RNA sequence: CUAAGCCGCCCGGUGGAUGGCUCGGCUCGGGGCGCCGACGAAGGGCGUGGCAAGCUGCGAUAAGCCCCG
RNA sequence: ACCGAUAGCGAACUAGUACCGUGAGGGAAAGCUGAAAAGCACCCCGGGAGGGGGGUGAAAAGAGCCUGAAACCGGGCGGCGAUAGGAGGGUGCGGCCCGAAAGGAAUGAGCCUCCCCGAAGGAAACCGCGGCGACGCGGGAGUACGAGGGGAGGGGACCGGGGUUGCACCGUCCGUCUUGAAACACGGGGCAGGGAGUUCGCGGCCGUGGCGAGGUUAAGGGGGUUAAGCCCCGUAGCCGC
RNA sequence: CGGCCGCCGAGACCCCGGCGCACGGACCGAUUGGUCCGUGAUCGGGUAGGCGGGCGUGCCGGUGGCGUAGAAGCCGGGCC
């Protein structure tokens, strides 16, 4: 995957980055992106740091089966996707670098578009009772992000 | 099953001309011959010089809405008009002193079709 | 598919006759605007042309 | 022209009132929704086959347009598909309108349009 | 400026249909040609390339050696 | 006048190969960059995979490479959205939204005003009378109105169509055996491709065409041809008399 | 319970315009076809089944064509 789903990208005012074939949960990636959308880059990085440190739960709105609630208001199911947070943090650092190279003030960068997709699946099998072999697969994730220097 | 009618464009045109001529002259002979000609091909009439000899008279006009075959003998002098003639049939008609013409020529000679006898 | 010999002969006759029909020839698409006459009969010397 | 206009209006009203005839359960499955069509219901218990009130209707011979204006362009002309200038040359400007085939390139479309406009021939897709 | 959720369009991922192509198949009247082996056959095993695993070809002279065109 | 990569031989390719069974034996999947590798020099970041610039190319067609559909998933946009019930639809219209082209239209749209004819059908005011009463009878009147059919003036850009949703009424899915299917009867997670009255021999009929007291050739032979096409003969035989 | 007076209510019945079918008639097109007129209160539901016409796909013999000024294919939309 190379293309982005953003329509009106402007190279003069915007920067973009992506990651492909990440070996993380696409569901949790979608959930984290939903929360990161619309935030400033620094705020998003601090958000991810808190999630990684387990100081801040991520709410679950779509994939939340058999998930317990968390202390405070708005919870409701939540969890701490550390691996997803780490990968997305690396992508955010990459896009920050792209903006800096283009010559955009890093303190005014707002995440205008961020999305996650399901990529290719790596197949595997696991043995089970009664001589049956059963699917045992990894689902990879694509991440895309484009930030804009607001004014 | 459907009756597709004659496949011969000449025969179809002859049928149309026959009906038109009947309307023009206010008679029924030509329309009768037309609906007899449009009979199914497995039922088209075939007549023999023997039958013509049996039921005709000298100097008479006969119309066969089909084919005329040359089995038997002819001794009368008759003018016969039919869609087709076999070689033997036509030879016998000519040798008897008559003439073997087509339906178009019969109409041209006798537009009103008075005294013409249909045979099937 | 079988074809009776006499029926095939009649079909050949009809085709040869239709060859000399002005309306059919032009209706088939052929350009006969400058042809002098249909049917076009030519002297036997045409048989010896080799080039 | 009086009867022509009356029947043209009648056809317009009829074909505005007419529905889109689609097979049963077309909306329920993507395989049918992506390829809209009408198929006669032939089931023993098919409600559409029974023609019950409250179910989609079926095509009938009574929906046909009036004979005089059947198949005509809504503008009233008779459509003729044209692929070249020679084909366009054999058209009647007073009663027929030329529709340029979708396959002819702009190069030939230029001459087709020029000939049409100098002959006073209506073109439905002049570009 | 509605949380979840449903329908429609656009973009993107997943997937490999469709269209086009074809050194491959299949079927044929006619035509050609039809045996090899104790002077060791067919079939097979193992070897053989500078980097060489499969296929193909070759046999300790081993992807080859000699002679006439 | 064969198929065109789920087709055609099982094998278009390192296919009777990989792999399965002790064995006899069984047996797949898998074609395509571009005209030319010109197959991305250099720069920033990342542990790396890669990402972003910048180059090549008519076009990334970027090797995970012709075209790139459907099902499925993520985002953006338009409509609905936490007091509301029916197989997810039908009829009619109202909100909100899209409306360049292919549909109508400035040679004039929605719309407003005025005049004429008018089928089936069809009032009332008002007046007279009958009935205990609901009410009815005669005049008004076959008048007003009426589907639709025509003409004139004003205004100047929308009507048709589409997405979603609101309301009123109606609507218990599809195929099947069955007397009877919404069925607590059977088959129905979704999408794409494949999939089921074919060939010969004999007999009965019909639609059409040739010849006709006759019809027709089979095996085969000759001419010509790139060729198996084309032309001519061939009375054995078969049926009818 | 015995009667009466109004009104509402179908695709039924009446009227207007349109389509097809059955039968008969007149015209044109060189094979099954096309146009128009007349009659229908005595034509218009439909399972098994019978008959007629038409739509669509691959290849062949002809005929007339399109295309790098952009074919097939694919997504959305307009018209018949």
Distance CA B18, CA B24 (A): 10
Distance CA A33, CA A81 (A): 12
Which residues lie across from A141 on neighbouring strands? A22, A118
Contact indicator for A141, A29 with CB cutoff of 8 Å:
yes
Nearest partner of B52 among B96, B9, B110, judged by Cα: B96
Distance CA D124, CA D106 (A): 15
| DSSP state for residue D83 in the 8-state scheme | -
Distance CA D65, CA D54 (A): 25
Residue nearest the C1' of F215 (CA based): C4
Nearest partner of B103 among B120, B79, B86, judged by Cα: B79
Count of CB atoms situated within 10 Å of the CB of B113: 21
Contact indicator for A120, A95 with CB cutoff of 8 Å:
no
Distance CA C14, CA C8 (A): 10
Nucleotides of strand G under 7 angstroms from a protein beta carbon:
11, 17-20, 25-32, 35-36, 44-45, 47-48, 51-53, 63-72, 75-76, 79-80
D37 touches strand F (CB under 7 A): no
Burial of B21 (0-12, 13-18, 19+ CB in 10 A): buried
Chains that touch D (3 or more CB pairs under 8 A): none
Question: Which nucleotide lies closest to B2 by the C1' atom and the CA atom?
Answer: F207
Instruction: Specify the resolution in Å.
Output: 2.8
| DSSP state for residue A102 in the 8-state scheme | H
Q: CB within 7 A of strand E: which residues qualify?
A: A 1-7, 34, 61-62, 117-121, 142, 144; D 33
Tokens coding B86: 């076999």
Those residues with Cβ within 8 angstroms of residue A34's Cβ, 6 or more apart along the chain or in another chain: A61
Length of chain D: 127
Chain A 103-132 residues in 7 Å CB range of strand F? 113, 115-120
Looking from the CA of C42 toward its CB, the CA atoms found within 13 Å total 7
Rg (CA), chain A: 18
Distance CA C18, CA C39 (A): 10
Contact indicator for A139, A22 with CB cutoff of 8 Å:
no
Rg (CA), chain D: 21
Residue B19's SS3 state is: helix
Q: What is the largest CA-CA distance in chain D?
A: 62
Nearest partner of A109 among A41, A24, A44, A60, judged by Cα: A41
D108-119 core/surface letters (b: 16 or more CB in 10 A; e: else): ebeebbebbeee
Length of chain A: 151
Distance CA B90, CA B101 (A): 9
DSSP E strands in B9-59: the ranges are: 45-48
Contact indicator for A96, A106 with CB cutoff of 8 Å:
yes
Chain A 49-78 residues in 7 Å CB range of strand F? 62
CA dihedral sign, ordered A89, A95, A101, A105: negative
Edge-to-edge strands, sheet with A138-149: A14-22, A138-149, A109-122
Distance CA A112, CA C14 (A): 83
- Between strands B99-101 and B78-85, the pairing is parallel
- Between strands B60-69 and B116-118, the pairing is parallel
∠ CA(B40), CA(B46), CA(B52), 5° rounding? Answer: 145
A23-47 core/surface letters (b: 16 or more CB in 10 A; e: else): ebbbbbbbbbbbbbeeeebeebbeb
Question: Which nucleotide lies closest to A59 by the C1' atom and the CA atom?
Answer: E3
Count of CB atoms situated within 10 Å of the CB of D120: 8
Query: In which residue are the tokens 């740091």 written?
Result: A49
CA of D88 to C1' of E51 (A): 71
Looking from the CA of B4 toward its CB, the CA atoms found within 13 Å total 6
Distance CA B89, CA B72 (A): 9
Contact indicator for D71, D96 with CB cutoff of 8 Å:
no
Question: Which nucleotide lies closest to D104 by the C1' atom and the CA atom?
Answer: G66
């Amino acid at each position: 995957r190379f293309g982005y789903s953003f329509q009106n990208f402007d190279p003069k005012r915007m920067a973009r980055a992506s990651a492909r074939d990440l070996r993380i949960s696409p569901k949790l990636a979608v959930e984290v992106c939903r929360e990161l959308r619309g935030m400033m880059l620094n705020d998003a990085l601090r958000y991810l740091d808190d999630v990684i440190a387990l100081k801040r739960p991520v709410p679950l709105k779509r994939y939340n089966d058999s998930q317990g609630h968390k202390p405070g208001k708005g919870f409701g199911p939540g969890r701490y996707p550390v691996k997803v947070a780490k990968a997305i943090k690396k992508v955010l650092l990459n896009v920050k670098n792209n903006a800096v190279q283009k010559g955009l003030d890093p303190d005014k960068l707002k995440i205008i578009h961020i999305a996650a997709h399901k990529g290719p699946v790596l197949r595997g099998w696991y043995p089970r009772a009664f001589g049956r072999a059963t699917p045992f697969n990894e689902q990879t994730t694509h991440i895309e992000v484009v930030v804009e220097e607001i004014r | 099953m459907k009756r597709t009618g004659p496949t011969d464009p000449n025969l179809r045109r002859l049928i149309r001309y026959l009906r038109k001529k009947s309307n023009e002259y206010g008679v029924k002979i030509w329309k009768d011959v037309a609906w007899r000609l449009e009979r199914p091909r497995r039922q088209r009439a075939e007549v023999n010089v023997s039958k013509i000899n049996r039921y005709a008279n000298d100097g008479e006009m006969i119309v066969v809405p089909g084919s005329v075959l040359g089995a038997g003998k002819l001794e009368k002098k008759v003018i016969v008009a039919a869609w087709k003639f076999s070689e033997t049939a036509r030879r016998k008609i000519i040798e008897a002193g008559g003439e073997a013409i087509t339906i178009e020529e019969l109409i041209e000679r006798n537009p009103t079709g008075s005294g013409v006898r249909i045979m099937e | 598919e079988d074809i009776n010999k006499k029926e095939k002969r009649l079909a050949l006759m009809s085709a040869i006759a239709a060859t000399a029909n002005y309306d059919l020839v032009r209706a088939r698409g052929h350009i006969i605007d400058n042809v002098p006459q249909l049917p076009l009969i030519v002297v036997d010397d045409l048989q010896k042309v080799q080039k | 022209e009086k009867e022509f206009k009356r029947l043209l209006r009648v056809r317009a009203r009829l074909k505005r009132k007419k529905p889109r005839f689609l097979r049963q359960e077309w909306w329920r499955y993507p395989k049918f929704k992506n390829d809209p069509k009408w198929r006669r219901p032939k089931g023993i218990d098919s409600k559409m086959r029974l023609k019950l009130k409250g179910k989609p209707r079926s095509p009938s011979i009574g929906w046909s347009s009036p004979k005089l204006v059947r198949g005509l362009h809504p503008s009233g002309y008779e459509e003729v598909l044209v692929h070249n200038v020679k084909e366009l040359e054999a058209l009647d400007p007073k009663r027929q309108a030329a529709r340029i085939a979708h396959t002819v390139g702009k190069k030939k479309r230029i001459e087709i349009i020029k000939r049409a406009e100098e002959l006073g021939i209506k073109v439905l897709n002049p570009r």
